[PDB]
């Protein structure tokens, strides 16, 4: 709560996880199983970084382990997805899962029911591009998702208020008028409703794959999925 806006931004920028590579193997064609394998193997490795990133989000480590578990269980796929959409901004029509795994919508058809989710992710990437979403805004949004998504399941709300001040500060510093500031704040936060929707559909899809024995999921993923 002590942190200034500039300190908050620096903290969040510093905590950013790396972009990981997939285990993509260009020697063989994709199958439904092999693509699901790549994507879930990637998610799994990302998760370990996500856990350590969360610990660096102001206020998170003050919570009980149970509360930390609950927030990450609620938000993990939302966080993976907003990360994906951010990575994919400078690649119209494609999703940059990894630098060696850049897929267009046609490749999503490889997995039953996946292309619908690709389409939503692509539309969100387009919206980010239309808004000219900045990196400093992105990290604020990602932290908001972590702290908000499972919060209704005061300390947390104070941090959330601090991130709001931070978003407004960034916008003011960028020269937006006062009216433009609350309008953009709203536009950015309404994106979070769409990210929630995609996460819910993505979770249903993943559950479907598991229940059809399409891909072996790690114990961690099984449990993250089971929390839903």
């Amino acid at each position: 709560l002590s942190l200034t806006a500039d300190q908050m931004v620096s903290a969040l920028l510093d905590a950013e996880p790396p972009i990981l590579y997939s285990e993509y193997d260009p020697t063989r064609p994709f199958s439904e199983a092999s693509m699901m394998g790549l994507l879930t193997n990637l998610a799994d490795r990302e998760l370990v970084h996500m856990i350590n990133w969360a610990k660096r989000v102001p206020g998170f480590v003050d919570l009980t382990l149970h509360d930390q578990v609950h927030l990450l269980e609620c938000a993990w796929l939302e966080i993976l997805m907003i990360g994906l959409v951010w990575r994919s901004m400078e690649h119209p029509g494609k999703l940059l899962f990894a630098p060696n795994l850049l897929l267009d919508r046609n490749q999503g058809k490889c997995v039953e029911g996946m292309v619908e989710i690709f389409d939503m992710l692509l539309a969100t990437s387009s919206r980010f591009r239309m808004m000219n979403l900045q990196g400093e805004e992105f990290v604020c949004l990602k932290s908001i998702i972590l702290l908000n998504s499972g919060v209704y399941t005061d300390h947390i709300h104070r941090v959330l208020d601090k991130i709001t001040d931070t978003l407004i500060h960034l916008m003011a510093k960028a020269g937006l008028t006062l009216q433009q500031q609350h309008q953009r704040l709203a536009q950015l936060l309404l994106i979070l409703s769409h990210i929630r929707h995609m996460s819910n559909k993505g979770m249903e899809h993943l559950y479907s794959m598991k229940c059809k024995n399409v891909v072996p999921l790690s114990d961690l993923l099984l449990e993250m999925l089971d929390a839903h």
């Binding site: 856990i51 382990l65 149970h66 930390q68 578990v69 990450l72 269980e73 961690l220 449990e223």
Partner: peptide, 11 residues
């Protein structure tokens, strides 16, 4: 306890 519960500690 959940595996996440463990990872939140180790490290």
């Amino acid at each position: 306890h959940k595996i996440l519960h463990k990872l939140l500690q180790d490290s």
